[PDB]
């Protein structure tokens, strides 16, 4: 039955099983075989199709050049989450298998370049940051005490939240919050270089974000897709930042610029990339607030 058909290990097994051909034997194969479904088949199982080609097309997606480039920038899980919103955007669904595979693949093949294109144009200047001096020029660029300390508090922690607080027009409640969050992680010895610990920081920082899907841009715009941008992320603190260890008092910097740079968040990035700033600076006992001139260095978005 469908139910069991769906349990196989791979569209191969799936389409085997119900298009009866054991010499179906790539996710190609069964795309190819759409076409050979007689229409009133087609019309009787549309919904078990649909699965499937979602599926073949994945399949296919996940090894073609692209895909294996996006694999090598933000690994397994995220990749084949990407393919599947693409397919499911550009795939064109059961009418497309049956019609033009071909035409569709190498659509989402442009699909896909164009999202790693992005993604490396990122991560030429992110990981340029490793072999720059960052503490001259811009890149050490400070800002004014009375620019976001009026009070003229002198503790550290209540300076790194003020300036928070400043950047982001933060106010009553919600200025608390990025107070109290401050404190916690300056002090809870959690992993900065782990992103399931970021998302559940950015979830209490900015609360009721909405998470929905932005795909690649491929009207000339730049942004990253929002689960490149994350995988992108990801990869940065749990990979990079691991093989090609910064100094302490660097690292804020480059958690700033990770995230802003990336666009590791569908939003509060900005929230995030100052927050984590903060904390690594409070964790190597020092704040040095940013400039504009040396973020806008940091996370090189124009």
């Known amino acids: ?121 990122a991560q030429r200047h992110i990981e340029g940051l490793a072999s720059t001096d960052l503490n001259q020029g811009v890149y050490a660029e400070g800002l004014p005490e009375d620019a976001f300390n009026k009070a003229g508090v002198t503790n550290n922690v209540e300076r790194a939240a003020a300036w928070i607080i400043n950047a982001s027009n933060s106010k009553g409640n919600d200025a608390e919050n990025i107070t109290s969050l401050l404190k916690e992680y300056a002090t809870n010895g959690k992993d900065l270089l782990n992103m399931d610990n970021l998302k559940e920081l950015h979830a209490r920082l900015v609360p009721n974000v909405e998470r929905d899907y932005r795909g690649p841009n491929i009207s000339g715009g730049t942004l990253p897709s929002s689960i490149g941008g994350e995988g992108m992320l990801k990869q940065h603190i749990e990979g990079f930042l691991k093989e090609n260890p910064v100094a302490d008092k660097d690292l804020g910097k480059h958690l700033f610029a990770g995230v802003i740079g990336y666009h590791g968040f569908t ?18 006992d020092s704040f040095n607030p940013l400039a504009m001139n040396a973020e806008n260095s940091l996370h090189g978005i124009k």
């Open 1 to 121: 039955g469908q139910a069991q058909r769906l349990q196989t290990s791979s569209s191969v097994e799936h389409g085997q099983m119900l298009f009866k051909d054991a010499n179906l034997k790539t996710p190609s194969d069964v795309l190819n075989a759409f076409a050979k479904l007689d229409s009133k088949m087609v019309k009787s199982h549309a919904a078990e199709l649909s699965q499937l080609a979602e599926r073949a097309m994945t399949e296919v997606m996940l090894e073609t050049d692209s895909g294996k480039n996006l694999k090598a920038l933000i690994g397994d899980d995220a990749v084949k989450s990407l393919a599947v919103r693409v397919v499911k955007d550009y795939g064109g669904g059961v009418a497309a298998a049956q019609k033009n595979p071909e035409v569709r693949i190498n659509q989402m093949q442009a699909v896909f370049d164009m999202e790693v294109m992005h993604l490396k144009a």
């Open 267 to 284: 939003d509060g990035n900005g929230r995030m990339g100052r927050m984590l700033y903060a904390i690594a600076e409070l964790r190597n």
